[PDB]
Amino acid sequence: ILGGREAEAHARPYMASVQLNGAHLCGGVLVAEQWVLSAAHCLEDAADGKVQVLLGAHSLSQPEPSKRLYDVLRAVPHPDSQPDTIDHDLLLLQLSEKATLGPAVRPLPWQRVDRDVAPGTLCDVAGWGIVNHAGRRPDSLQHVLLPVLDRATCNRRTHHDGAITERLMCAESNRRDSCKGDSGGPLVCGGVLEGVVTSGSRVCGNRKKPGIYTRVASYAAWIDSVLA
């Protein structure tokens, strides 16, 4: 997260760290007792590597009573996802068992009505991604409040030049933004999951290159199918 602040410990009990070989790789969001939603590019070339999900965390390295590392039974990338595209960039991870729920571990309600979030809505994005241009990695969860950017402005030649489909949304990236390592994390608006940070490489904190988030409402039937 660039231009953000340290999050209040355990105030976002749905927040997951998706780890590969014991290191934070991507953000994720607990959407059901046994399922974490993240981004499909997260597990590219991860083939053989150990994927785990850390729930109930604030610090990645310090002991906390609510912290629990879960193994993953199945990793389900969206079938239409591809390495060279930003489309259908979703991944569902089935945990080894249902998560132990409590004040610090709880699934987030997610948007099932396919209607756009109004431009200007203030949404929250959290993650353990880089915090500066040198690549400094925070030990604790960071967050930033970002206003939603209308799709037509996001699609201008100066911005993302027509790449923003109806299944994607944008948020302003003016010195405050999601960055490397925040991919897969949640974009929460009015206490409901609206988007998942995309995992394509992009410059951070440059107002001319808005943040791109996959709209979960646009994938409600796929999310339901996988869990079933």
Ligand SMILES: COC(=O)c1ccccc1CNC(=O)N1CCC[C@H]1C(=O)Nc1cccc(OC(F)(F)F)c1
């Ligand atoms: C919104 O995303 C952007 O704007 C963005 C801007 C540049 C490169 C990339 C991105 C977004 N893509 C990712 O993050 N991806 C792609 C899938 C894997 C994941 C990644 O690379 N994980 C990672 C790797 C090393 C260290 C690390 O940990 C920490 F982050 F702590 F360093 C995390």
